[PDB]
């Protein structure tokens, strides 16, 4: 029975948060400067709170709402809020799957769309934006999203992404209807295919030119940017979002386990496997990313050398990258009148700046892996395999999330006595798909950025904080420890008690305080926006109406607890 529960938890935890979100989160916050807090935030926040969730799931042996209502009525709201967050997650998570579907369907063509730029119009060169950016970046930002230059500018619903999202939701609904316990052979298959695909892409990814640059960028802990509180916040929230803490379905999963089971081994194993999968996927992604950065640096050096050679009438191969500055000085010393004209035009390029600004954003995984595919031998087969592994991961994670969404609805006899579960699930999927059309607009990627960074980011911290305070202080840690010891024969270790009672809540509170102080001091929340004319990413301030949505997404889920407490107090009085 241990294998079933462990593999169920692994299949829930291992999803797009490990393969897709972790790489771009690591790239955005400095690479190593993000990896050091992650590990630091895994020993303190991941393991103890995951173990606490699994133990509450066993000792209550009820659902999330049932458990947090049986501990105390004044607290039942934290069971409701843990559902709402899942809702918001299921509202936008599917968009990622849609994108993969798109990238799958554009994978049966000999001239792969992200391989060759379109012709300029003279039929003699390439597009300006497709040349300034990469072919993969041009495909991702224009052919896939058609991203608008700013959040204030939005068009209509792009029909192709809308159809892809509709297909993804239909697939999710079909998986919901079809199977619920036939995961026997799937757990044997769906847990090894992602690792096999990542192994293949690692085998390709570690033989590319300049892969070590990517690894060095990944593993170098720059102290200068290590002081950013946002890096710590993002590390903690990614840990919570990848382990599933706060969504309330881990409690339901542990509710079906025997009370004479070791949840100290299972929690440790699940957390370590999640961490290892994230690290491996990010290693492959950053090896390919380092190859991209090295290629960009070499291309810039070649362009500068060609510019100098075509003007100074130097030999074809005389000006190389190993003697550039000296020959530049020699040319400058030869005659300054000619050199003065083009000195603005000569561009400075270095590996470091390219590494920071080669590829960044929520499309890092897609761009990087499409580039790697375009450098394969049979690109179609590897593209199909990778975007099928990604499809399986997304579908499994969404099955877990939607089960967490739907179980409270099915368990409610008020709704279950009026409509079939097949109709309740159909209505839920329809509502989610209809609301998620806002991510398919021209400026839909910015709303996806907002939901990816605020819908299920900080609410998971407050939910887990309330849960751990509830378990430790309201219920009584001595009573909980005695109950657990009676259930499993072994008393909880002193380390787990220490991390439950004081360390994790204090660290969460400190992180919240630091984030709030940083936001107040900065006073200007900014987002990345695509610039096709410059062909890169620029920072723009959020408009007035985008802050209302940002505030409400967190506020509804977090404030659902105190409102329930106030309602219970009113009912008592």
Ligand X SMILES: *[C@@H]1O[C@H](CO)[C@@H](O)[C@H](O)[C@H]1NC(C)=O
Which residues lie near ligand X (CB under 6 A)? 120, 122, 344, 346-348
CA distance 373 to 393: 19
Binding segment (CB under 6 A) for ligand YCP, from list 14-22, 104-112, 148-156, 359-367 = 14-22
**Residue 300 Cβ vs ligand X, minimum distance, rounded to whole Å:** 11
Indicate which of Cl ion, ligand YCP, ligand X, none lies near residue 348 (CB less than 5 to 8 Å, by partner kind).
Answer: ligand X
Q: Quick one: which of 287, 305, 422 has its CA closest to 368?
A: 287
CA distance 7 to 191: 8
- Residue 13 as a binder of ligand YCP (CB under 6 A): the answer is yes
Would you give the DSSP letter of residue 527? E
- State whether the Cα torsion 47-53-57-60 is positive or negative: positive
Pairing between β-strand 526-531 and β-strand 536-541 as defined by DSSP bridges: antiparallel
Indicate which of another protein, Cl ion, ligand YCP, none lies near residue 106 (CB less than 5 to 8 Å, by partner kind).
Answer: another protein
Indicate which of another protein, Cl ion, ligand YCP, none lies near residue 278 (CB less than 5 to 8 Å, by partner kind).
Answer: Cl ion
Do the Cβ atoms of 373 and 389 come closer than 8 Å?
no
Strands annotated E in 464-511: none
- Residue 315 as a binder of another protein (CB under 8 A): the answer is yes
CA distance 472 to 478: 8
Indicate which of another protein, ligand YCP, Cl ion, none lies near residue 171 (CB less than 5 to 8 Å, by partner kind).
Answer: another protein
- Residue 457 as a binder of Cl ion (CB under 5 A): the answer is no
Residue 141 CA to chain centroid, in angstroms? 18
Do the Cβ atoms of 91 and 435 come closer than 8 Å?
yes
Indicate which of another protein, ligand YCP, ligand X, none lies near residue 178 (CB less than 5 to 8 Å, by partner kind).
Answer: another protein
Q: Which residues contact 497 (CB under 8 A, 6 or more apart)?
A: 477, 481
Q: Under rule CB under 8 A, which residues in 83-102 are in contact with another protein? A: 101-102
Indicate which of ligand YCP, Cl ion, ligand X, none lies near residue 446 (CB less than 5 to 8 Å, by partner kind).
Answer: none
CA distance 108 to 110: 7
* Ramachandran quadrant class, 347 (left: phi over 0; alpha: psi -120 to 50; beta: rest): beta
Do the Cβ atoms of 441 and 169 come closer than 8 Å?
no
Q: Compute CA distances 3 → 61, 185, 257, 266, whole Å.
A: 19, 13, 12, 10
Binding segment (CB under 8 A) for another protein, from list 17-25, 260-268, 283-291, 311-319 = 311-319
- Number of shown-chain residues binding ligand YCP (CB under 6 A): 12
- Residue 58 as a binder of ligand YCP (CB under 6 A): the answer is no
Binding mask 223-242 for ligand YCP (x = CB under 6 A): ------------------xx
Contact pick of 43, 116, 321, 491 for another protein (by CB under 8 A): 116
Indicate which of another protein, Cl ion, ligand X, none lies near residue 242 (CB less than 5 to 8 Å, by partner kind).
Answer: Cl ion
Q: Under rule CB under 5 A, which residues in 225-284 are in contact with Cl ion? A: 242, 278
**Residue 301 Cβ vs another protein, minimum distance, rounded to whole Å:** 14
CA distance 13 to 25: 17
- Residue 17 as a binder of ligand YCP (CB under 6 A): the answer is yes
Contact pick of 128, 422, 518, 541 for another protein (by CB under 8 A): 422
Contact pick of 401, 452, 459, 504 for ligand YCP (by CB under 6 A): 401
**Residue 269 Cβ vs ligand YCP, minimum distance, rounded to whole Å:** 16
- Residue 16 as a binder of ligand YCP (CB under 6 A): the answer is yes
CA distance 140 to 281: 20
Residue 539 has phi, psi (to 5 degrees) of: -100, 130
Q: What SS3 class is residue 119?
A: strand
Q: Quick one: which of 445, 435, 410, 426 has its CA closest to 172?
A: 426
- Name the residues that contact Cl ion, by CB under 5 A: 18, 22, 242, 278
- Name the residues that contact another protein, by CB under 8 A: 101-102, 104-106, 108-109, 111, 116, 118-119, 122-125, 163-164, 166-167, 170-171, 173-174, 177-178, 309-310, 313-317, 420, 422
């Amino acid at each position: 029975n241990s294998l079933q529960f462990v593999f169920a938890c692994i299949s829930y935890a291992v999803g797009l948060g490990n393969v897709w979100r972790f790489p771009y989160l690591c790239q955005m916050y400095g690479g190593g400067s993000f990896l050091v807090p992650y590990i630091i935030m895994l020993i303190v926040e991941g393991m103890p709170l995951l173990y606490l969730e699994l133990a509450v799931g066993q000792r209550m042996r009820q659902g999330s709402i049932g458990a947090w209502r049986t501990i105390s009525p004044y607290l039942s709201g934290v069971g409701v809020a843990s559902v709402v967050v899942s809702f918001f997650l299921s509202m936008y998570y599917n968009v990622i799957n849609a994108w993969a579907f798109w990238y799958l369907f554009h994978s049966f063509q000999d001239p792969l769309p992200w391989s060759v730029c379109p012709l300029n119009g003279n039929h003699t060169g390439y597009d300006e934006e497709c040349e300034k950016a990469s072919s993969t970046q041009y495909f991702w930002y224009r052919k896939t999203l058609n991203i608008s230059p700013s959040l204030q500018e939005n068009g209509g619903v792009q029909w192709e992404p809308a159809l892809c999202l509709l297909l993804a939701w239909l697939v999710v609904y079909l998986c919901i209807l079809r199977g619920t316990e036939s995961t026997g052979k799937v757990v044997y298959f769906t847990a090894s295919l992602p690792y096999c695909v990542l192994i293949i892409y690692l085998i390709r990814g570690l033989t590319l030119h300049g892969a070590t640059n990517g690894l060095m960028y990944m593993f170098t802990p720059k102290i200068e940017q290590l002081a950013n509180p946002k890096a710590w916040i993002n590390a903690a929230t990614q840990i919570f979002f990848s382990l599933g803490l706060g969504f309330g379905s881990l409690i339901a999963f542990a509710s079906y386990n025997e009370p004479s089971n070791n949840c100290q081994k299972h929690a440790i194993i699940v957390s370590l496997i999640n961490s290892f999968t994230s690290i491996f996927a990010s290693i492959v992604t950053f090896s390919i990313y380092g190859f991209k950065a090295t290629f960009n640096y070499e291309n810039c050096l070649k362009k500068v050398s060609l510019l100098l050679t075509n003007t100074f009438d130097l030999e074809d191969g005389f000006l190389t990258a190993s003697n550039l500055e000296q020959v530049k000085g020699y040319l400058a010393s030869a005659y300054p009148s000619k050199y003065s004209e083009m000195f603005p035009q000569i561009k400075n390029c270095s590996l470091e700046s390219e590494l920071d600004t080669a590829v960044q954003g929520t499309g890092l995984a897609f761009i990087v892996y499409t580039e790697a595919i375009k450098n394969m031998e049979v690109s179609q087969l590897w593209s199909v395999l990778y975007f099928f592994m990604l499809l399986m991961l997304g579908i499994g994670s969404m099955l877990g999330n939607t089960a967490a969404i739907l179980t409270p609805l099915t368990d409610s006899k008020i709704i279950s006595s009026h409509l079939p579960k097949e109709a309740i699930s159909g209505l839920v999927c329809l509502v989610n798909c209809a609301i998620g059309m806002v991510f398919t607009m021209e400026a839909g990627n910015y709303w996806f950025d907002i939901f990816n960074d605020y819908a299920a980011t900080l609410s998971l911290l407050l939910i887990v904080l309330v849960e751990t305070i509830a378990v430790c202080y309201v219920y009584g840690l001595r009573r909980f420890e005695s109950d657990l010891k009676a259930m499993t024969g072994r008393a909880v270790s002193w380390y787990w008690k220490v991390m439950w009672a004081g360390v994790s809540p204090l660290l969460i509170v400190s992180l919240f305080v630091f984030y709030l102080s940083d936001y107040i001091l900065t006073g200007t929340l900014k987002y990345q926006a695509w610039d096709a004319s410059q062909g890169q990413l620029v920072t723009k301030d959020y408009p007035a109406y985008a802050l209302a949505v940002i505030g409400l997404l967190v506020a509804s889920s977090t404030m659902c607890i105190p409102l329930a407490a106030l309602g219970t107090f009113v009912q008592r009085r």
